[PDB]
Amino acid sequence: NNSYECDIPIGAGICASYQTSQSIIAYTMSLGAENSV
Amino acid sequence: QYGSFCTQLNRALTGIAVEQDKNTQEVFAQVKQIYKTPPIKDFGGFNFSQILPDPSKPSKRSFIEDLLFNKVLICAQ
Amino acid sequence: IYQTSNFRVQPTESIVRFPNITNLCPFGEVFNATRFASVYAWNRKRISNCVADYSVLYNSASFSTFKCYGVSPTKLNDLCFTNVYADSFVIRGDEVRQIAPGQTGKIADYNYKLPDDFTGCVIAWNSNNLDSKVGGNYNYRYRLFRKSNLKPFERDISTEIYQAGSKPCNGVEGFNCYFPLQSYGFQPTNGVGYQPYRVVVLSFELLHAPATVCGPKKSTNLVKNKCVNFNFNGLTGTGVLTESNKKFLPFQQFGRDIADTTDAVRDPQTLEILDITPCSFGGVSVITPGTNTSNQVAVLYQGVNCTEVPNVFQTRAGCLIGAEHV
Amino acid sequence: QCVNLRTRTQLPPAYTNSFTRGVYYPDKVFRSSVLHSTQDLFLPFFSNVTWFHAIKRFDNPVLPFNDGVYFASTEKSNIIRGWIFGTTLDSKTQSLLIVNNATNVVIKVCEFQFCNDPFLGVYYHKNNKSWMESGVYSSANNCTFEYVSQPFLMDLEGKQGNFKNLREFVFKNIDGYFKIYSKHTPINLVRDLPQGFSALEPLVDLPIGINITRFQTLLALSSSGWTAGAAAYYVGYLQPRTFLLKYNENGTITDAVDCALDPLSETKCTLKSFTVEKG
Amino acid sequence: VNQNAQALNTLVKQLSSNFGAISSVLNDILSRLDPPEAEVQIDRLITGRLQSLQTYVTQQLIRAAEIRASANLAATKMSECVLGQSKRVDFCGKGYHLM
Amino acid sequence: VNQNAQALNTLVKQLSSNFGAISSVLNDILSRLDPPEAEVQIDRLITGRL
Ligand SMILES: *[C@@H]1O[C@H](CO)[C@@H](O[C@@H]2O[C@H](CO)[C@@H](O)[C@H](O)[C@H]2NC(C)=O)[C@H](O)[C@H]1NC(C)=O
Ligand SMILES: *[C@@H]1O[C@H](CO)[C@@H](O)[C@H](O)[C@H]1NC(C)=O
Ligand SMILES: *[C@@H]1O[C@H](CO)[C@@H](O)[C@H](O)[C@H]1NC(C)=O
Ligand SMILES: *[C@@H]1O[C@H](CO)[C@@H](O)[C@H](O)[C@H]1NC(C)=O
Ligand SMILES: *[C@@H]1O[C@H](CO)[C@@H](O)[C@H](O)[C@H]1NC(C)=O
Ligand SMILES: *[C@@H]1O[C@H](CO)[C@@H](O)[C@H](O)[C@H]1NC(C)=O
Ligand SMILES: *[C@@H]1O[C@H](CO)[C@@H](O)[C@H](O)[C@H]1NC(C)=O
Ligand SMILES: *[C@@H]1O[C@H](CO)[C@@H](O)[C@H](O)[C@H]1NC(C)=O
Ligand SMILES: *[C@@H]1O[C@H](CO)[C@@H](O)[C@H](O)[C@H]1NC(C)=O
Ligand SMILES: *[C@@H]1O[C@H](CO)[C@@H](O)[C@H](O)[C@H]1NC(C)=O
Ligand SMILES: *[C@@H]1O[C@H](CO)[C@@H](O)[C@H](O)[C@H]1NC(C)=O
Secondary structure (H helix, E strand, O other): OEOOOOOOEEOOOEEEEEEEOEEEEEEEEOOOOOOOO | OOOOOOOHHHHHHHHHHHHHHHHHHHOOOOOOOOOOOOOOOOOOOOOOOOOOOOOOOOOOHHHHHHHHHHHHHOOOO | OOEEOEEEEOOOOOEEEOOOOOOOHHHHHHHOOOOOOOOOEEEEEEEOEOOOOOOOOHHOOOOOEEOOOOHHHHHHHHEEOOOOOEEEEEEHHHHHHHHHOOOOOOOHHHOOOOOOOOOOOEEEEEEEHHHHHOOOOOEEEOOOOOOOOOOOOOOOOOOOOEEEEEEEOOOOEEEEOOEEEEOOOOOOOOOOOOEEEEEEEEEEEOOOOOEEOOOOOOOOOOOOOOOEEEEOOOOOEEEEEEOOOOOOOOOOOOOOOOOOOOOOOOOOOOOOOEEEEEEEEOOOOOEEOOOOOOOOEEEEEEOOOOOOOOOOOOOEEEEEEEOOOO | OOOOOOOOOOOOOOOOOOOOOOOOOOOOOOOOOOOOEEEEEEOOOOOEOOOEEEOEEEEEOEEEEEOOEEEEEEEOOOOOOEEEEEOOOOOOEEEEEEEEEOOOOOEEEEOOOOOOOOOOOOOOOOOOOOOOOOOOOOOOOEEEEEEEEOOOEEEOOOOOOOOEEEEEEEEEOOOOEEEEEEEOOOOOOOOOOOOOOOOEEEEEEEEEEEEEOOOEEEEOOOOOOOOOOEEEEOOOOOOEEEEEOOOOOOOOOOOOEEEEHHHHHHEEEEEEOOOOOOO | HHHHHHHHHHHHHHOOOOOOOOOOHHHHHHHHHHHHHOOHHHHHHHHHHHHHHHHHHHHHHHHHHHHHHHHHHHHHHHHHOOOOOOOOOOOOOOOOOOO | OOOHHHHHHHHHHHHOOOOOOOOOHHHHHHHHHHHHHHHHHHHHHHHHHH
């Protein structure tokens, strides 16, 4: 359910990476950090 | 019997080669003549001893140029 | 500058080295055989480790029909063969046109077929004088019916009774059953096309193994460092033969070693791993001033040493003649 | 002319993982320092094998033959001495007989009459270091081909702690030809199949063109009562697949990779490389 | 560099395909058949190799026409960032350009 | 201009090549041979010109 910067793009906003034991995990892309002004 | 195809092919390849030579000539040769840095350098405390040419080299490359050159069958074809 | 008329070096002589001659292939006894068996019991023979001259057979008019498919017979003596597959039988003349591959017929499908990529040569010759019997040469039999047509070059000898229906065949003959073999009617009174015909076929492969069947050899020598024409074992090429440090196993020949070209190769009659190198080539170019001004030109040979070609100044891009360095 | 044997250790067949065995030189031509992908008959990686023993324990079954066979044998004093190949084994079809005679291997292409339990009879009932072999064979009326091999001699005795004798043979019967590829190498391990990679140089090819669908092995064999050391042999079945072989500059097959086993192997076969970047 | 090498490698691998003929060596087919029916086999190889060569030339044309744009962009950047100061945002560096 | 003019000429001359056929005039081959063995000749010219 988390968000991280994309490594291996799959498509439709969903992409995967290799991370911690260690496995391949797919998730929704994160549009960078967020802040207000 | 097939006529004139190889003339077209050779013309295209020669045009490509001449275009590449023209590109290389145009990108760099932007200055009419060649300058040279004075032997003594006092640039207000700044340091440029990594990009300026180094005489102690068979070629005239600089340090960063050498580093870039390092980072990057032959006759069967 | 203009690039025209690419330059190349022409060859000088030829080398026709071949392995040692052994003896003459005994194909004559096949062609002068006493008795010929039936179609389904064809005479199959393997001929190897000898030297055969097919020019005499080709020039001989003793045969009647002679069709070579995979190769032109005229130069048949200029190819080395790994092995010879000789298949012989006797057939009715009217059906002779079943010999060719891709044909349709009774013997051509039921009990004798040929592959699509067949490269051998077929000979058919009438033998009505000696093969015909006054009472009928009925020793020759064939399969009138076959449950499944056999693949090319496989022998069927089963004596099964014909099964033309789903109902079982009982006893020696049952329902829709017939004898597997039918005799051939060969008599001296038979007309043209009904006479017996001796049919032989020769098959062989190319370059898969060091061949042993060849013809005349005329091996001369192993000269080096010359643009010569090598024809060691069928591969005809032009180039220079040098000595290489490359290593072969005791059974390795015809190295490709890059993409598709015959690289350093061994030689017959000896054991040395020779190396093949193509002759020098390059694209000559002409540099000229305005022809309105003058007429003297200069010639640049690209990327090639001009220590040999028939005020020079060899450069990195090649070498230039007709002009003097300053 | 034989005595049937039933003094066998009746056990279900054992299975072992054939890690990296069953790769050989495809063609007679030579390449070097390149990568070549080709499809042919091979033993797939990580496959079961059929295990038989020999010491009581005299495993002599009859195994079906199809698409060639891969025979491995670990032993000392090479008790196995012969192979029989055929279809009906009753003097009704051409049969192939291979016996490693004391001089060399003898090849016999004859419509030979096998019995129920034929074997290479050795009169070694009493252990007195007497290998006198006056054994005789049955009728061999119909014969077609005969061959004599090179006189290569191998050790016939020994009780070494580590099983020094290890043979790997591959038999392929296709397009009317019989290809035998052989290799021998010592191993210091007791039972486990060696881990690693080994090449396979060809040995011989024979143009025979006969039909064989069954085979059995022969070893040095009164009918009942024998004293021989432990020995094991594995039988594996081939399959048509595609392999990518990585040659070397010296002309030796360094490694091979499958093209239908695992997805990573599929990607390696696609990219024609041994290393793949993330993506 | 990898693309340029790949183009040539794929072009040179083409000299070992039947193209519908019976072999892939001109010398072999020349020395294995009579010239009355050698053209009927040579023509297929000629057509196939013409097709391959034309495809390679077209690919090279397109790639060179693409790289001309990068050459022009580099020339403009050299004429603007170096011999002066350029006020175009996010052209000569990310931020406020100096030299 | 010249380069463009270099193309059209190299097209027009293409109308004077055998292309593996027996001639280079459609009228000649049409009026010198019956159709059923004339399609097998016209097809080569069609392919080359395409
Ligand atoms: C620019 O910085 C470099 C790196 O420190 C200076 O090179 C050093 O100079 C000192 C004194 O001459 C030497 O002891 C070091 O060994 C040098 N470093 C290297 C990596 O060679 C250079 O002198 C500076 N340029 C100036 C001060 O004009
Ligand atoms: C968080 O992940 C778990 C694991 O799949 C899932 O069951 C759950 O629905 C997720 N929660 C949200 C809010 O997406
Ligand atoms: C074989 O027969 C041919 C003609 O039938 C004859 O010319 C030749 O001499 C014969 N050879 C032998 C060895 O009988
Ligand atoms: C070939 O024959 C020649 C002379 O007849 C002999 O010197 C040479 O050793 C022979 N070589 C082979 C490979 O038979
Ligand atoms: C050749 O050059 C001379 C020198 O100017 C000039 O006078 C003459 O017209 C030129 N001729 C041609 C044909 O260009
Ligand atoms: C080619 O020329 C260079 C320069 O003279 C020389 O070093 C080299 O040996 C020459 N090679 C041949 C094969 O002539
Ligand atoms: C050019 O200079 C070199 C170096 O002194 C000399 O050897 C050479 O002869 C000179 N060339 C001419 C044409 O004088
Ligand atoms: C090998 O056989 C055993 C039992 O006979 C079985 O459990 C195992 O799955 C087999 N191996 C493979 C790879 O299927
Ligand atoms: C087989 O081996 C025996 C025993 O050494 C030997 O006498 C014989 O000559 C060999 N060959 C044959 C064909 O029996
Ligand atoms: C080989 O023999 C088996 C068993 O007799 C038979 O089923 C098969 O059809 C035979 N195949 C050939 C090609 O003879
Ligand atoms: C290749 O063989 C030579 C001689 O047998 C040997 O010196 C060399 O080390 C071998 N190459 C490699 C990579 O082992």
